[PDB]
Amino acid sequence: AAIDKLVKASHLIDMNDIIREGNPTLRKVAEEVTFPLSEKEEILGEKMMQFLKHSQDPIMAEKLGLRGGVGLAAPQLDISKRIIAVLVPNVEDAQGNPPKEAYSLQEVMYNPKVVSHSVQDAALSDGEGCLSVDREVPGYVVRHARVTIEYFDKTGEKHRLKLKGYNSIVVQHEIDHIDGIMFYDRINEKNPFAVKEGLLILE
Ligand SMILES: [Zn+2]
Ligand SMILES: [Zn+2]
Ligand SMILES: [Zn+2]
Ligand SMILES: [Zn+2]
Ligand SMILES: [Zn+2]
Ligand SMILES: [Zn+2]
Ligand SMILES: [Zn+2]
Ligand SMILES: [Zn+2]
């Protein structure tokens, strides 16, 4: 099975492990994980975070042929489980000084879900892309501006967290994957750049 290939100690996730648009697994509702986690599910989580780290590292991205990412969901690896990894880096200042915090968000989340959210919507100005989508897709992907999420970490500890800004957008994108929803499902069908009054456009 896919899981067996992915969790081998020496195996590094790369683009050849990422399934593409059209594969039915991307449209399923992923299965909840049970705790305590199996070794496979723990290792998968670690491999997913490793992939994100590598995708953001100039050398390793080059060695492995990686498209840069800030999030990854198990369904994109053909594993229909409610597991996501998110890694959103902070940026250097104009003087080249590293940020105080390397990441605004770094987590492997099991059974994550949105439990509440703002009435206000938001969308990235530049739209969204997807590791599984090898097409140009224009338009505002309309999401909740702010969300409260619950999730479990690999230990089974429950977390409750409010998110805004880019963190909110990233987590929503990944949670959509484990519900079988694709980013373009949330782009206006008639005018991709339509703006409903009050939409928060994030630069
Ligand atoms: Zn591989
Ligand atoms: Zn079930
Ligand atoms: Zn471990
Ligand atoms: Zn490494
Ligand atoms: Zn709601
Ligand atoms: Zn929602
Ligand atoms: Zn609750
Ligand atoms: Zn459409």
From Swiss-Prot:
EC number per UniProt: 3.5.1.88
Gene3D superfamilies reported in the protein's UniProt record: Peptide deformylase
Cofactor: Fe(2+)
UniProt enzyme class: hydrolase
Active site: E174
Cofactor binding annotation: Binds 1 Fe(2+) ion.
Keyword set includes Hydrolase: yes
Keywords annotated in UniProt: Hydrolase, Iron, Metal-binding, Protein biosynthesis
Gene Ontology biological process terms from the UniProt entry: co-translational protein modification; translation
Binding site for Fe cation: C130, H173, H177
GO molecular function: metal ion binding; peptide deformylase activity
Signal peptide per UniProt: none
Catalysed reactions listed for this entry: N-terminal N-formyl-L-methionyl-[peptide] + H2O = N-terminal L-methionyl-[peptide] + formate
UniProt xrefs under InterPro entries: Peptide_deformylase, Peptide_deformylase_sf
PANTHER family: PEPTIDE DEFORMYLASE, PEPTIDE DEFORMYLASE 2
Family label: Belongs to the polypeptide deformylase family.
Function: Removes the formyl group from the N-terminal Met of newly synthesized proteins. Requires at least a dipeptide for an efficient rate of reaction. N-terminal L-methionine is a prerequisite for activity but the enzyme has broad specificity at other positions.
HAMAP family assigned to the protein according to its UniProt record, in alphabetical order: Pep_deformylase
Name of the protein in question: Peptide deformylase
The species this protein was found in: Streptococcus agalactiae serotype III (strain NEM316)
